[PDB]
Amino acid sequence: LEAIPCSIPPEFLFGKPFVF
């Protein structure tokens, strides 16, 4: 069981604006 968020960290080549 991993205790982690469901959002992406900064510093990415690809990733549409769905986390702001």
Side-chain angles (χ1 to χ4, degrees):
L1 275 303
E2 278 289 9
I4 50 170
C6 223
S7 169
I8 195 74
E11 310 176 62
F12 51 88
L13 267 293
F14 52 85
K16 277 171 177 56
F18 284 109
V19 290
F20 293 83

Short mmCIF file of all heavy atoms in Angstrom, two decimals:
data_model
loop_
_atom_site.label_atom_id
_atom_site.label_comp_id
_atom_site.label_asym_id
_atom_site.label_seq_id
_atom_site.Cartn_x
_atom_site.Cartn_y
_atom_site.Cartn_z
N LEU A 1 0.85 -1.20 0.00
CA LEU A 1 0.00 0.00 0.00
C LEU A 1 0.88 1.24 0.00
O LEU A 1 1.53 1.55 1.00
CB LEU A 1 -0.99 0.03 1.19
CG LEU A 1 -2.32 -0.72 0.98
CD1 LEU A 1 -3.07 -0.21 -0.25
CD2 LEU A 1 -2.15 -2.23 0.85
N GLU A 2 0.89 1.98 -1.11
CA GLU A 2 1.63 3.25 -1.23
C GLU A 2 0.75 4.46 -0.86
O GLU A 2 -0.32 4.68 -1.44
CB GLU A 2 2.21 3.41 -2.65
CG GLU A 2 3.53 2.65 -2.84
CD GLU A 2 4.72 3.28 -2.09
OE1 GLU A 2 4.52 4.21 -1.27
OE2 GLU A 2 5.87 2.82 -2.28
N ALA A 3 1.23 5.23 0.12
CA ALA A 3 0.62 6.47 0.60
C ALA A 3 1.20 7.68 -0.16
O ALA A 3 2.21 8.27 0.25
CB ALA A 3 0.83 6.56 2.12
N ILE A 4 0.59 8.02 -1.29
CA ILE A 4 1.05 9.06 -2.23
C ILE A 4 -0.14 9.87 -2.80
O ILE A 4 -1.25 9.35 -2.87
CB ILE A 4 1.87 8.44 -3.39
CG1 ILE A 4 1.15 7.25 -4.06
CG2 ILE A 4 3.28 8.05 -2.89
CD1 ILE A 4 1.82 6.77 -5.35
N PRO A 5 0.08 11.13 -3.24
CA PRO A 5 -0.95 11.94 -3.89
C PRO A 5 -1.42 11.36 -5.24
O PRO A 5 -0.88 10.36 -5.74
CB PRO A 5 -0.32 13.34 -4.02
CG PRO A 5 1.18 13.07 -4.05
CD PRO A 5 1.33 11.87 -3.12
N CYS A 6 -2.41 12.00 -5.86
CA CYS A 6 -2.96 11.64 -7.18
C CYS A 6 -2.74 12.75 -8.24
O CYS A 6 -3.41 12.77 -9.27
CB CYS A 6 -4.43 11.22 -7.00
SG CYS A 6 -4.77 9.72 -7.98
N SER A 7 -1.77 13.63 -7.96
CA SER A 7 -1.34 14.77 -8.77
C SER A 7 0.10 14.58 -9.24
O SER A 7 0.90 13.89 -8.60
CB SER A 7 -1.47 16.03 -7.90
OG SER A 7 -0.85 17.16 -8.47
N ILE A 8 0.45 15.20 -10.37
CA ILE A 8 1.77 15.12 -11.01
C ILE A 8 2.75 16.17 -10.44
O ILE A 8 2.36 17.32 -10.22
CB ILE A 8 1.58 15.27 -12.54
CG1 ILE A 8 2.81 14.85 -13.38
CG2 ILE A 8 1.18 16.69 -12.94
CD1 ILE A 8 3.00 13.33 -13.44
N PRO A 9 4.03 15.83 -10.16
CA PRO A 9 5.06 16.80 -9.80
C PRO A 9 5.40 17.74 -10.98
O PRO A 9 5.08 17.41 -12.13
CB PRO A 9 6.27 15.97 -9.38
CG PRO A 9 6.11 14.65 -10.11
CD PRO A 9 4.60 14.49 -10.21
N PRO A 10 6.09 18.87 -10.75
CA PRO A 10 6.63 19.71 -11.82
C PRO A 10 7.72 19.00 -12.63
O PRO A 10 8.11 17.87 -12.33
CB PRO A 10 7.17 20.96 -11.10
CG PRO A 10 7.60 20.42 -9.75
CD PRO A 10 6.51 19.38 -9.45
N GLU A 11 8.25 19.68 -13.65
CA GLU A 11 9.37 19.22 -14.49
C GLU A 11 8.98 18.02 -15.37
O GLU A 11 9.35 16.87 -15.10
CB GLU A 11 10.65 18.97 -13.66
CG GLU A 11 11.08 20.10 -12.72
CD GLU A 11 12.30 19.68 -11.89
OE1 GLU A 11 13.38 19.39 -12.46
OE2 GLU A 11 12.21 19.62 -10.64
N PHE A 12 8.20 18.28 -16.43
CA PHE A 12 7.69 17.29 -17.39
C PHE A 12 7.65 17.82 -18.83
O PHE A 12 7.15 18.92 -19.10
CB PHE A 12 6.28 16.80 -16.95
CG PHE A 12 5.27 17.90 -16.65
CD1 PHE A 12 4.47 18.44 -17.68
CD2 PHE A 12 5.14 18.40 -15.34
CE1 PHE A 12 3.56 19.48 -17.40
CE2 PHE A 12 4.22 19.43 -15.06
CZ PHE A 12 3.45 19.98 -16.09
N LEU A 13 8.14 17.02 -19.79
CA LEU A 13 8.03 17.32 -21.23
C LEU A 13 6.57 17.34 -21.69
O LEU A 13 6.13 18.32 -22.30
CB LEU A 13 8.86 16.29 -22.05
CG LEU A 13 10.31 16.69 -22.37
CD1 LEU A 13 10.38 17.88 -23.32
CD2 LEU A 13 11.14 17.01 -21.12
N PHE A 14 5.80 16.31 -21.34
CA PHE A 14 4.42 16.07 -21.77
C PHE A 14 3.47 16.00 -20.57
O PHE A 14 3.83 15.50 -19.50
CB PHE A 14 4.37 14.80 -22.64
CG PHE A 14 5.00 13.56 -22.04
CD1 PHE A 14 4.27 12.73 -21.16
CD2 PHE A 14 6.34 13.23 -22.34
CE1 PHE A 14 4.87 11.59 -20.60
CE2 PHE A 14 6.94 12.09 -21.78
CZ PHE A 14 6.20 11.27 -20.90
N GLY A 15 2.25 16.53 -20.74
CA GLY A 15 1.27 16.68 -19.66
C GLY A 15 0.35 17.89 -19.86
O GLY A 15 0.70 19.00 -19.45
N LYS A 16 -0.82 17.70 -20.47
CA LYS A 16 -1.85 18.74 -20.62
C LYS A 16 -2.34 19.31 -19.27
O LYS A 16 -2.33 18.57 -18.28
CB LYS A 16 -3.04 18.18 -21.42
CG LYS A 16 -2.80 18.24 -22.93
CD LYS A 16 -3.90 17.47 -23.68
CE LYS A 16 -3.77 17.54 -25.20
NZ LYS A 16 -2.45 17.05 -25.67
N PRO A 17 -2.80 20.58 -19.22
CA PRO A 17 -3.17 21.30 -17.99
C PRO A 17 -4.45 20.78 -17.31
O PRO A 17 -5.51 21.41 -17.39
CB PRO A 17 -3.24 22.78 -18.40
CG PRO A 17 -3.67 22.71 -19.87
CD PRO A 17 -2.91 21.49 -20.36
N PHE A 18 -4.35 19.65 -16.63
CA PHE A 18 -5.44 18.93 -15.95
C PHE A 18 -5.21 18.74 -14.43
O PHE A 18 -5.81 17.86 -13.80
CB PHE A 18 -5.66 17.59 -16.67
CG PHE A 18 -6.40 17.69 -17.98
CD1 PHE A 18 -5.74 17.47 -19.20
CD2 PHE A 18 -7.79 17.94 -17.98
CE1 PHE A 18 -6.46 17.52 -20.41
CE2 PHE A 18 -8.50 18.00 -19.19
CZ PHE A 18 -7.83 17.79 -20.41
N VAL A 19 -4.30 19.54 -13.85
CA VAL A 19 -3.79 19.45 -12.46
C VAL A 19 -3.53 20.83 -11.81
O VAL A 19 -2.74 20.94 -10.86
CB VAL A 19 -2.52 18.57 -12.41
CG1 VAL A 19 -2.81 17.08 -12.67
CG2 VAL A 19 -1.44 19.05 -13.39
N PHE A 20 -4.16 21.90 -12.30
CA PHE A 20 -3.99 23.29 -11.81
C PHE A 20 -5.33 23.88 -11.40
O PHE A 20 -5.66 23.80 -10.19
CB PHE A 20 -3.26 24.15 -12.86
CG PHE A 20 -1.82 23.77 -13.12
CD1 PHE A 20 -1.53 22.72 -14.01
CD2 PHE A 20 -0.76 24.46 -12.49
CE1 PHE A 20 -0.19 22.38 -14.30
CE2 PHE A 20 0.58 24.12 -12.78
CZ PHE A 20 0.86 23.08 -13.68
#
